[PDB]
Amino acid sequence: ESEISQEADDMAMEKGKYVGELRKALLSGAGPADVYTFNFSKESCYFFFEKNLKDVSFRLGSFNLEKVENPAEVIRELICYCLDTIAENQAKNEHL
Amino acid sequence: LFTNEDNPHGNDSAKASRARTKAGDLRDTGIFLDLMHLKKPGGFDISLFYRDIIS
Amino acid sequence: MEELEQGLLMQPWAWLQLAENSLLAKVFITKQGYALLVSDLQQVWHEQVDTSVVSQRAKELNKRLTAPPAAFLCHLDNLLRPLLKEATFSCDCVADALILRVRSELSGLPFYWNFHCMLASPSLVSQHLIRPLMGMSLALQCQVRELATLLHMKDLEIQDYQESGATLIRDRLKTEPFEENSFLEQFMIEKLDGKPFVMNLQDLYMAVTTQ
Amino acid sequence: MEELEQGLLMQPWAWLQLAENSLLAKVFITKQGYALLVSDLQQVWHEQVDTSVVSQRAKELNKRLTAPPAAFLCHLDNLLRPLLKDATFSCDCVADALILRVRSELSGLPFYWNFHCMLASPSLVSQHLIRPLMGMSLALQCQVRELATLLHMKDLEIQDYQESGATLIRDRLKTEPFEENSFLEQFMIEKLPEACSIGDGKPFVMNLQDLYMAVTTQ
Incomplete structure (x- = not known):
């Protein structure tokens, strides 16, 4: 937390912008108006995203990632979620 | 007299002077002129001509 | 020193949006920190401080990151631009205890904007700016x-236009020759915070302070 | 108390004939000490005294000065000038503060009384040396x-007479409308230095003393 005010003196945004910044950093691609670095420090299990505006670059909040192994099960869950949401969207398509 | 405006003779001084002279003459004859306030978006705005041309 | 102060005198007056007092500020942020010489006409901001104060303000306001003092003064020279009409650098109307009143959380968690602040002094009403002001007085008086x-x-030309004129007269209005004694009298007697001063001398100061 | 802050405010600009400084100057005739007034925005060069401090600077600021407070209250009382007749007035420029002495002279002995202009009392300064500011803007920039x-x-009277049948006959009475916009345009480049010059108080006390009385009244 608290990773919001770090830009408050830097670019002088307003509050709550961090919520949208985080949401669009989580969603596919970078922010439409916010620069982000998309990487992963496997050595430290840590993620970070950027925030630059008004003629100077700065460092937005970051993910203190936690390493939990067994990628197989979580990948299976993710792909099952993909297939199920495709199926429900197709059902909505045919009903409509 | 029914109007909201004294500008017609408020334009030319010669006809205004002649009109007020005639009105004074008619007052001498005993004619009592009376004027009414009439509807005007800019108001009556009296005395442009009629300030002492009223008996 | 010289070029900062001279170009600052040449820098147009800046009215930082504070809405509490009147800020007659001169901004020239090129080197030696942010040379934002503000003056509320009752307490001057001798804010020509070097980049050290800029870094101090950057760090006192960023509680988990940093703002480079050079970059801090640079983007404050970009932050004051949406202020002469954001982070409105509001300051209290008090003429003797001057603290920036930027009181709003830009984070959801507490944060504020503040410059280095100075208070009133017994010696603050006889240094520079009423020399250009009094020069404006002389300019307007000689113009008068x-x-x-x-x-x-x-x-006197018009008097010729009285004997040689043919203007239509309805007799509802009479124009007299332009008198001189009553003219000077009305110029003296008849016709006659800091907000009025600043919005009255935004343009006339720079146009006269060149001397 | 208004005899050193208000009456001093109601004192027209009149540069006292100092010997070293060309700064703004005027002294107020009081029964409560001489009063200077120099308004130049943010380094007070002001000389204000009461009976007590004039008594002190009589008894200790000069090697030979037996003149009591009443002596200097009379000297100022027997003074009619924010200027110098030569009470000999002289300037010893030791600081930007206007050294403004009113000697122990009453058309006679030039008894010793010298100055080191202190930073005067801010109560009678900040109250009515900033009044120049808003009063001056609000009065001058509107009435001019x-x-x-x-x-x-x-x-407009000239032009409507001319088009109404008062055409020009000679160059002396040929003067078409002249506006303040082009006037400012030409003045800021030609007559601005002539009329932006505080100087030694030569134009500062003739177009600006009554102007500044209008300023302080406003």
């Missing part, structure tokens, strides 16, 4: 003298 | 422009 002699000469 | 508009109205 020229306008006035032109008044008198033009009115 | 209204006089320019009087020019403009008289020029």
